[PDB]
Amino acid sequence: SSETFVFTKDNLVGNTQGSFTFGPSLSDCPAFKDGILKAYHEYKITSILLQFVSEASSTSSGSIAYELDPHCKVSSLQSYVNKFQITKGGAKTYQARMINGVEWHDSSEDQCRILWKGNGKSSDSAGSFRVTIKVALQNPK
Amino acid sequence: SSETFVFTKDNLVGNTQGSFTFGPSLSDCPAFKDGILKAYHEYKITSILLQFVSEASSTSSGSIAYELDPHCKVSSLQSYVNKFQITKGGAKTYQARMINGVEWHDSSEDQCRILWKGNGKSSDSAGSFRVTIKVALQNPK
Amino acid sequence: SSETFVFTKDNLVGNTQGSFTFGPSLSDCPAFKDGILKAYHEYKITSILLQFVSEASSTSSGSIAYELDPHCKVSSLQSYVNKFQITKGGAKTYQARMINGVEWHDSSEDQCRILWKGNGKSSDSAGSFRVTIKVALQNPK
Amino acid sequence: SSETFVFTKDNLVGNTQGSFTFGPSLSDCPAFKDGILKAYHEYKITSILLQFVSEASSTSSGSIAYELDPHCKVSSLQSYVNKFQITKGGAKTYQARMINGVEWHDSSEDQCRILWKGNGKSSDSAGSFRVTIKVALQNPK
Amino acid sequence: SSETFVFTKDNLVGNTQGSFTFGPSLSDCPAFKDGILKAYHEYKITSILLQFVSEASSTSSGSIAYELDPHCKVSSLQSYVNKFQITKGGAKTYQARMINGVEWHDSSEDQCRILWKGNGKSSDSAGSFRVTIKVALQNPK
Amino acid sequence: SSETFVFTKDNLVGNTQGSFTFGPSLSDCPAFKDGILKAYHEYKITSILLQFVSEASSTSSGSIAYELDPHCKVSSLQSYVNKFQITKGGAKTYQARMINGVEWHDSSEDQCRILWKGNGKSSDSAGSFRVTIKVALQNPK
Amino acid sequence: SSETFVFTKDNLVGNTQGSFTFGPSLSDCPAFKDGILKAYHEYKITSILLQFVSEASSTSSGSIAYELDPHCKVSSLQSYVNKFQITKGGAKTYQARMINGVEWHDSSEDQCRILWKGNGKSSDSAGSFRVTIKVALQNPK
Amino acid sequence: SSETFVFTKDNLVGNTQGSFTFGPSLSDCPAFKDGILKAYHEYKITSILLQFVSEASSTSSGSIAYELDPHCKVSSLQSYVNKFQITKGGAKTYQARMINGVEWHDSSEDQCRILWKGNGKSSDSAGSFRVTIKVALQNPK
Amino acid sequence: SSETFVFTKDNLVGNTQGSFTFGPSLSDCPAFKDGILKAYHEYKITSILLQFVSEASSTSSGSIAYELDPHCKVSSLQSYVNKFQITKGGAKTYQARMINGVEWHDSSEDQCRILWKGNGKSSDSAGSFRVTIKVALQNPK
Amino acid sequence: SSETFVFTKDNLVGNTQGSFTFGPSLSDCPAFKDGILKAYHEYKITSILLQFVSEASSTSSGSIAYELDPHCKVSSLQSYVNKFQITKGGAKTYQARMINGVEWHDSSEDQCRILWKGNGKSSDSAGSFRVTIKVALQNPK
Structure with a gap:
């Protein structure tokens, strides 16, 4: 499924x-938070494609950093x-063994x-992060 | 998907x-009602397996009738x-072209x-209808 | 044809x-609106290639979002x-089953x-949307 | 069936x-109007053979025109x-994808x-239209 | 195309x-006159099937003559x-090299x-000329 | 040749x-205007590669549009x-049948x-159009 | 033909x-000028064999020059x-693509x-130009 | 090229x-002198076919001599x-290594x-020298 | 290892x-400086992938130069x-024989x-140099 | 060698x-000017890869033009x-026959x-031209 x-x-x-925070704490995807996840006992996310789609001016300096953290144990970036x-x-594709x-x-x-x-200015805009997850679920509830 | x-x-x-009533009006499956269906533009249900799992006494007389109605246009049974x-x-499996x-x-x-x-008594019990739908969705939202 | x-x-x-809104409500292509469509009973659009060709300055920030909506039922973007x-x-190519x-x-x-x-400024310019549709028609009129 | x-x-x-108007509005075939169609939920007409069988004099001038209209949206001929x-x-055979x-x-x-x-005289006679439809029905009622 | x-x-x-007069001067086919022809720079008509479909009485004498004229330089029949x-x-099919x-x-x-x-009477009727053209277009506009 | x-x-x-305007009216290539063309009766241009090589600032907004016009009959752009x-x-390569x-x-x-x-400003600079034509000539003069 | x-x-x-000047302006071949050409809409000359058959004295100096001019746009020799x-x-055979x-x-x-x-004397004689054309015609008139 | x-x-x-004098000093072929040669940095002439086409009387005595001179260093014949x-x-064909x-x-x-x-008389005429050069050019300008 | x-x-x-300075003088990677290197007698770095990941504005001019220096003998750039x-x-990948x-x-x-x-301004920002080294170690300590 | x-x-x-000016007049490469060239009688440069590596701001307009000139006979650009x-x-690779x-x-x-x-401003900066030549030498001295 x-x-x-x-x-x-x-x-x-x-x-x-x-x-x-993927799983039952995604506030940004309710169709996975309290949608398909309330109808199954157990799941696993097979892949995560995180995409940064920037509508930013070409005179805006900065770079948004990111880390994977496969076990939910850090609250800041720190790397x-x-x-x-x-x-x-840009775009970054994470397979199953990474996540x-x-x-x-x-x-x-x-x-x-x-x-x-990110380390850019507090006035520029780079609204982004189209995220595509592939999740599998097996035990219905 | x-x-x-x-x-x-x-x-x-x-x-x-x-x-x-399958689709966005299933009050009996919220993980399909406002779960996976809020995250996609369009869907189709590939198959429907409706199963009557009876915990009823062997001295209870009656029979629960059912119809398919592939276009949501009737509110009573009438057949x-x-x-x-x-x-x-019992069990009844509906393929794609039927539904x-x-x-x-x-x-x-x-x-x-x-x-x-059903036409049984108003005191007996036949609690049932394990329903298994196979749905496909393609256009994310 | x-x-x-x-x-x-x-x-x-x-x-x-x-x-x-593709079909008889394209105000932007009269050769399809009241051109080839008035001479046939029925049609279908086989493919749609929507292309954003930007003549915009490299200091203009923003991003123009879009959705497909395969059944003409929404009037704003909402996604x-x-x-x-x-x-x-950019460019996005939609095949037959999507549209x-x-x-x-x-x-x-x-x-x-x-x-x-779009979410850009009301003074910048990004004049665009070269759209190429492939349509098939069969029943003459 | x-x-x-x-x-x-x-x-x-x-x-x-x-x-x-084929379907539940054929006043000219009651065995399909309120015959076989009242005993099934859904149908489709696989083929339509429309035949003009003329008993007309050889000195009668005129020609009876016809159009298919695969979606019931016109009330006059207009083509x-x-x-x-x-x-x-004459005779005209319409397959499944046309109708x-x-x-x-x-x-x-x-x-x-x-x-x-037709465009003939209001005194001549060309009594005709032997029509043969092939219809399939699947969901009984 | x-x-x-x-x-x-x-x-x-x-x-x-x-x-x-085929091309942008067909007053009898607006879906080719100001339909598909306004959306392309250049065209060519690959074939022309001209068909005379007569609803005429069998006591009407006469014969309607026709000529091809591959370069639009004559205004009367003259042949x-x-x-x-x-x-x-009848019917006459013109290939690509003729037209x-x-x-x-x-x-x-x-x-x-x-x-x-034609040379028939001014009271008889032979309403006809079902014409089927095959046109190719390449340079969009 | x-x-x-x-x-x-x-x-x-x-x-x-x-x-x-390609042929004997290219004021921008005299080696083809009154060079090789004065020594032959007839020619044809086999291909045209039009290339826009921009030395423009990244804060200059605009877009230069172009059309092919295979028969020299328009004086403005209009498309x-x-x-x-x-x-x-950018770059655009036109083959033989297009031109x-x-x-x-x-x-x-x-x-x-x-x-x-173009639709840019009257103060910016985008000096460009490296054009490479392949021409064949056969009848000497 | x-x-x-x-x-x-x-x-x-x-x-x-x-x-x-080949076509309807050959004053030297009336059987092609107002002969076979009045009975067809369109033609093309497949080949032209121009032959100089000289009855000239061996003490006459000079040389008669000639050019092809595949599009009727020059009135003097100029080459x-x-x-x-x-x-x-002598003799010169022109194929189809040249003419x-x-x-x-x-x-x-x-x-x-x-x-x-020619550049010879105004008193010598070199009466000549046996010309053999192969012409094809298709659309009768 | x-x-x-x-x-x-x-x-x-x-x-x-x-x-x-072949190259940029041919006064007798302007389509090579200031034609194709102004649009390229460098060239080489692959072959030269020099042909003497004589319209001379059969009682005119003499012989026109010629030499190749592969490096432009002589102004008279001298051989x-x-x-x-x-x-x-006559005719003489010079290949690439000779010229x-x-x-x-x-x-x-x-x-x-x-x-x-030549050594003939100053009153006879032998107007001639149809010359056919094959030139290759590589570096555009 | x-x-x-x-x-x-x-x-x-x-x-x-x-x-x-790769080896025991990397102050920027302590997990290689006094991490894995204190537990082995001898090492060699098999590959070095140096990557410049720029979060810089598109109006910042300059270029950061770099050299390899396979033997640690220079303290400034000088090339x-x-x-x-x-x-x-950008990115530059150095194999084993180079380093x-x-x-x-x-x-x-x-x-x-x-x-x-670098030669840019002292106010712009281009924070970068994601460096990935592949090191092999053999003699434990 | x-x-x-x-x-x-x-x-x-x-x-x-x-x-x-390649050869003994490169003031920009002394290791080829009075290095390897003083130890051989004759040379030839097999290939030249000229690369423009720009550290320029994205708001700087202009374009630096270049020509090959295979024989050292021009002192300005002129093309x-x-x-x-x-x-x-950018980058441009010249093979042996071009140079x-x-x-x-x-x-x-x-x-x-x-x-x-170049045609840019006299205040911007685009410091560049990494040039890689492949030269062969045979007769030692």
């Missing part, structure tokens, strides 16, 4: 922060290894938490 | 009535051709409406 | 809105999942309605 | 008009492309409407 | 005259070589002009 | 206009279907006329 | 001039590239114009 | 002299090894200079 | 300088051959030193 | 000019056919001269 869910993030300022540019948007997606998780367990943090 | 949904109906009295027995439960399931339907359109009506 | 039609949209401001950037233009293009439609029936809505 | 129905039209004057001659009768006969229609939905209009 | 267009001529008297009979209708249909023509250039002239 | 000719257009302002962006330059390049043309006949028209 | 026509030019003086000798006569003989021409259109001009 | 050029020499007297006869004309045609030459460099000198 | 290490450089100003652009970031990575190095020996030096 | 040489050009202003953009840098690199040149002979000329 696999299903894909596409959800977006709103008009983002350049120094934005946040976290996509600036890989990052998107605010002018030129704790090989074992079945209970429907009250968060799976993984992608976090971001 | 296909997905199966299993939902049940509660403790049924012998002279029960009702309707399973007693095929039916389940209250003592011996208006060959074309994509908008996510505010009801697809088909299975109706039932 | 297949035929391709290319039509454009005019000088677009950055916060533009609108809708391309910001996928979008073009105003600086870097209600598998069954023949009567020549007074609108088929699908692509909508857009 | 396929079945063929042959019905005729009466003694036709040379300037005759009319329409064969004189193809036509029968009043002296020499909106690929999807199942509800038993209160008209499917297609063949219309005719 | 090839397309076929079928258009007819109205109730014809026996001594009828006229001309089918009675080939002709249809008013009682027994100046090997090179691309601009969308303000008439291609060829089929002319007819 | 095939030969390729590369010629450029000068320092272009953002709202530029013009036309490349804004396809276009280059002033910031990001009236299948038949031999006399050396006093213009073949085709590519036109452009 | 192909046909060959052989026509000659009269007693030529050594400094002769002229032109063979002395290839030429016959007045003493030793504008690949497309059908209307019967009031001149096709090509071979011109000659 | 290879191309062939055919140019002739005018009415020649029997004791004629001259030189064909009478090979020669044409004034009565019987300094293996390396690319700049477009302001003369390549080779064929010279001639 | 191969292992990959990804480390980044902080918020970089446009005129930044520095050096990545501006290859370089990244501050607006458009002195074919022989085993002692764990107190620096291997190679990549240096950079 | 082939060898590659990489040399750069310094901090370039937007309206820069110059020339790379604006192909060019780089100042914002988006006079098929014959051996003496070590006091310049081979070819690439010239450039």
Whole structure:
């Protein structure tokens, strides 16, 4: 009973922060939060495609960094290894073994938490994060 | 992005009535009503397996009748051709061409409406209707 | 009797809105509106290639969002999942099964309605939307 | 549960008009109007063979025109492309894809409407239209 | 982007005259005149099937003559070589090399002009000329 | 006796206009205007590669539109279907059948006329149009 | 309906001039001028064999030059590239692609114009130009 | 970008002299002098076919001699090894290695200079020298 | 016992300088400096992928240059051959033979030193240098 | 004894000019000027890769043009056919036959001269021209 869910993030300022805690704590996708997840005992997210779609001016400087965090144990970013540019948007595709997606998780367990943090100005705009998850569910409820 | 949904109906009295209006009007499966259906533009239900699982006494007489109604245009049963027995439960599997399931339907359109009506006593119990739908969705939202 | 039609949209401001209701309600392509469509009973649009060709400055911030809406039932955008950037233009190709293009439609029936809505400034310019439709028609009139 | 129905039209004057609205509005075939159609939920007409069998004098001038109209949306002819001659009768065979006969229609939905209009005299006679439909029905009622 | 267009001529008297100047001067097919032709720079008509469908009495004498004229340079018939009979209708199929249909023509250039002239009575009727053109267009506008 | 000719257009302002009337009216390539063309009776241009090479600032907004016009009959643009962006330059390759390049043309006949028209500011600069034509000539003079 | 026509030019003086404008302006071949050409709408000349048959003395100096001119646009010679000798006569065979003989021409259109001009004395004699054309005609009139 | 050029020499007297300095100093072929050569940086002439086409009387005595001179360093003939006869004309074909045609030459460099000198009378006429060069050019300008 | 290490450089100003002295002198990767390197006698770095990930405005001019220096013997850049652009970031992958990575190095020996030096402004920002090294170690300690 | 040489050009202003006269007159590569060239009698440059590596702001307008000039005979540009953009840098690879690199040149002979000329502002910066030559030398000295 696999299903894909596409959800977006709103008009983002350049120094934005946040976290996509996947599972029953996605406030940004209610069709997965209290939609398909209330009708099954256990799930796992097979893949996560996180996409930064930037409507930003070409004179805006900065870069929005992100980390995967496969076990939901951090609340800030704390690691600036890989990052998107605010002018030129990007995309990152996470497979199953990266995102704790090989074992079945209970429907009250968060799976993984992608976090971001930008360093741009507090007046520019880079509203983005089209996110496409592929989730599989097996035990109906 | 296909997905199966299993939902049940509660403790049924012998002279029960009702309707399973599939689509955005299933009050009996919220994980399909305002779950996966709010995250896609259009859907179609590929198959419907309606199962009558009877916990009824062997001295209870009656038979619960049902009809398919592939276009949601009737509110009562009005046709007693095929039916389940209250003592011996049954099962009926509907494929795609029977249930208006060959074309994509908008996510505010009801697809088909299975109706039932029993003729048993108002004191017996035959709580049943394990229903398993296979639905496909394509245009994310 | 297949035929391709290319039509454009005019000088677009950055916060533009609108809708391309395909069929007999395209005000932007009269050669399909009251041209080839008045000489046939029924049609279907096999494919739609919507292209955003941006003549915009590299210091203009914003992003024009769009949705497909395969059944003409919405008048505003209401979904910001996928979008073009105003600086870097884009292209999106819709096949037949996405755009209600598998069954023949009567020549007074609108088929699908692509909508857009931008979030840029009301002074910038991103004049765009070269649209190429492939339509098939069979029953002459 | 396929079945063929042959019905005729009466003694036709040379300037005759009319329409064969197929489905539950055929007044000219009651064995399909309130016969086999009241015992099934949904139908589709697989083929329509319309035949003009003319008993007309060889000195009568005129030609009876006809159109298919696969979606019941016109009440007059309005298109004189193809036509029968009043002296020499004819025949026209419509397959499934022409007559909106690929999807199942509800038993209160008209499917297609063949219309005719002649230009002969109001005193001649060309009584005709042996019509043979092949209809399939699946969901009993 | 090839397309076929079928258009007819109205109730014809026996001594009828006229001309089918193909291209942007067909007054008898607006779906080709200001329909598909306004959306392309250049075209060519691949084939022309001219058909005389006669609803005429068998006591009406006469014959409607026609000529091809592949370059639009004559306004009357002036050549009675080939002709249809008013009682027994006919058909003539013109390929590409006959009708100046090997090179691309601009969308303000008439291609060829089929002319007819009958010698029957001014009271009889032979309403006819179902014409089917196959046109190809390449450069969108 | 095939030969390729590369010629450029000068320092272009953002709202530029013009036309490349190919043949004996190219004022921008004298080596083809009164060079190789005075020594042959007839020619044809096999291909035309029009390239927009932009030295423009990334804060300059606008887009230079162009059309092919295979028969030299228009003096303004009048069609804004396809276009280059002033910031990001482009390229368009026209084959033989598009540009009236299948038949031999006399050396006093213009073949085709590519036109452009921009909508940028009258102070910016996008000096461009490296054009490469492939021409064949056969009858010496 | 192909046909060959052989026509000659009269007693030529050594400094002769002229032109063979092929089509409806050949004054030197009336069997092609107002013979076979009045009975067809369109023609094309498949080949032209121009032969210089010299009855000239071996002490006469000079050379008669000629050019092809595939589009009837020049009235004098203006090009002395290839030429016959007045003493030793010659022959030149022109195929279809040289003489504008690949497309059908209307019967009031001149096709090509071979011109000659000699430089001999005004008292010598070289009477010549046996010309053999192969012409094809298709649309009768 | 290879191309062939055919140019002739005018009415020649029997004791004629001259030189064909190939490259940018051909006064006898302007379509190569300031035609195709102004649009390329560098060239080389692949072959030279020099042909003596004599319209001379059979009682005129003499012989026009010629030399190749692959490096443009002589202004008179100075070598009478090979020669044409004034009565019987001739032809000489020079390949690439003879005429300094293996390396690319700049477009302001003369390549080779064929010279001639006749010994006939100053009253006879042998107007001739149909010359056909095959030139290749590579670097556009 | 191969292992990959990804480390980044902080918020970089446009005129930044520095050096990545690989081995026991990486102050920017302590998990390789006094992590895995204290537990082995000898190592070698198999590959180095240096990536410039720019969050810089599109109106910032400059270019950050870099050199490899396979033997740690220079402290400034002194060579501006290859370089990244501050607006458009880049990537450079160094294999084993380039970076002195074919022989085993002692764990107190620096291997190679990549240096950079930019020429941008002292107010812009291009924070970058995601560096991924692949190191192999063999002799435990 | 082939060898590659990489040399750069310094901090370039937007309206820069110059020339790379290859051979013993490269002032920008002394390791080829009075390095390897003083130890051999004759050389030839097999290939030249000229690369424009731009550290320029995205609001700087202009384009730096260049020409090849395979024989060192021009001192200014004089031809604006192909060019780089100042914002988006580029690359051009010249093979052996383009750059006079098929014959051996003496070590006091310049081979070819690439010239450039920009049209940008006199205050912007686009410091660039990483040039990589492949040279072969055979006769030691």
